[PDB]
């Protein structure tokens, strides 16, 4: 099989920057090289065919070049909607093989998260589990620490988080952290707190509720 490599798996660039994604084949592929764009929702489109030809609807800021083993996809003035994973694909011989993909993020100004805490619903509690959710909304960059404290005691092993893809408009991330406890353990404690550390904040931010006053 021809092995296709995208040496750079992840790329960050400012709006209006010129960005180049690289693709290399394990042998000469004689310009038989296509580029695809996969958006964060999983939708795939053709971008460039036969090294350098634009597909229908592709804006002229996209170009491709190369020869032999090495190819380049260039975006000449990056827009926020170019947030995607870019895959090269060879058809010099069967089977068709794709590179491992290059994810493109927008570098933008540091933005602090808005932090919210959501208590568990009585609707959930009555079936024997409590989910406590901490939202960090619209922040940059992606690195962020969430710590759960219950009556000031640091929790570990009992939370999971997930992060959105970079927003195609404001280039921010959002993150959800869920603390899961038995109803019995939940009802043993008063103060539920998530403490957030991020570069955009002056110091760590704590959002909390007391089960009593909620």
């Amino acid at each position: 099989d021809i092995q296709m490599t995208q040496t750079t798996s992840s790329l960050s660039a400012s709006l209006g920057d010129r960005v180049t994604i690289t693709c290399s084949a394990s042998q000469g592929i004689n310009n038989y090289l296509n580029w695809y764009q996969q958006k964060p929702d999983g939708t795939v489109k053709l971008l460039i065919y036969y090294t350098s030809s634009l597909h229908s609807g592709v804006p002229s800021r996209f170009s491709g070049s190369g020869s032999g083993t090495d190819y380049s996809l260039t975006i000449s003035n990056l827009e926020p909607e170019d947030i995607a994973t870019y895959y090269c694909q060879q058809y010099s011989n069967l089977p068709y093989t794709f590179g491992g993909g290059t994810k493109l993020e927008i570098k933008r100004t540091v933005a602090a998260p808005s932090v919210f805490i959501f208590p568990p619903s009585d609707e959930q509690l009555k079936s024997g589990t409590a989910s406590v959710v901490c939202l960090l909304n619209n922040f940059y960059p992606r690195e962020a620490k969430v710590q759960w404290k219950v009556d000031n005691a640091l929790q570990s092993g009992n939370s999971q988080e997930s992060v959105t893809e970079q927003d195609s408009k404001d280039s921010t991330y959002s993150l959800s952290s869920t603390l899961t406890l038995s109803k019995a353990d939940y009802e043993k404690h008063k103060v539920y707190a998530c403490e957030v550390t991020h570069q955009g904040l002056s110091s760590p931010v704590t959002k909390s509720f007391n089960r009593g006053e909620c």
Binding site: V44, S114, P119, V133, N137, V163, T164
Partner: protein, 227 residues
């Protein structure tokens, strides 16, 4: 107006077979070759093979020779792929694609289906429970208000969430699902609004879990305390 409309998400057992379909429109089905592509969660694209709809001629990636069978139904403009002897390693998104030809021997996959999520598991379908995410209190000096829906304990992926039947899109974040240790998924969908615009609408999350034929509309009560 080239469209490749793939069948919905499928839960199938290990050792079994699954047949996924690709219903084409906006072009002449028998005039274009169709290719299939696998993508495992967080992984790259893999080429499975191609079929000539006019005679049913096939070409396979040898990695899938014992896995995949491509067929067509010319009369419904539909391509099929059947995956046999299923394992957890076959859990993936499968794409059907059209292969365009340019000049003599230039080929590219010019139009892609939306993909079909196949989950290979021995576990049973379970529809989600949907709980409100509503804060105990709002600050006078927080410039956005938040609420959401917790979509808990469903299997398999995926669920879709909309707010106010698609009318509310701005400020919506639907997080990636997390696999809990129970083997069930959970996900949150949240909305934020400028604090001054908060009171102008109600907020209802519309949850769709196709594998269990579950549809839940949950109104999240706006009521909260001042600190």
């Amino acid at each position: 107006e080239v469209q490749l409309q793939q069948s919905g998400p499928d839960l199938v057992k290990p050792g079994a077979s699954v047949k996924i379909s690709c219903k084409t429109s906006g072009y002449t089905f028998t005039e274009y070759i169709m290719h299939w592509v696998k993508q495992s969660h967080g992984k790259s694209l893999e080429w499975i093979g191609g079929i000539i709809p006019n005679n049913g001629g096939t070409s396979y990636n040898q990695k899938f020779k014992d896995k995949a069978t491509m067929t067509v139904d010319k009369s419904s403009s539909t391509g099929y792929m059947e995956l046999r002897s299923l394992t957890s390693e076959d859990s993936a998104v499968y794409y059907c694609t059209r292969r365009e030809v340019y000049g003599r021997n230039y080929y590219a996959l010019d139009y892609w289906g939306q993909g079909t999520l196949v989950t290979v598991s021995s576990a049973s379908t379970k529809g989600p429970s949907v709980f409100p995410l509503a804060p105990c209190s709002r600050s006078t000096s927080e410039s956005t208000a938040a609420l959401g829906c917790l979509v808990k304990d469903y299997f398999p992926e995926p669920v879709t969430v909309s707010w106010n039947s698609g009318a509310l899109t701005s400020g919506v974040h639907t997080f990636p699902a997390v696999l809990q240790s129970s083997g069930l998924y959970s996900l949150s969908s949240v909305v934020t609004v400028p604090s001054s615009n908060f009171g102008t609408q109600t907020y209802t999350c519309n949850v769709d879990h196709k594998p269990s034929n579950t549809k839940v509309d949950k109104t999240v009560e706006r009521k909260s305390c001042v600190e």
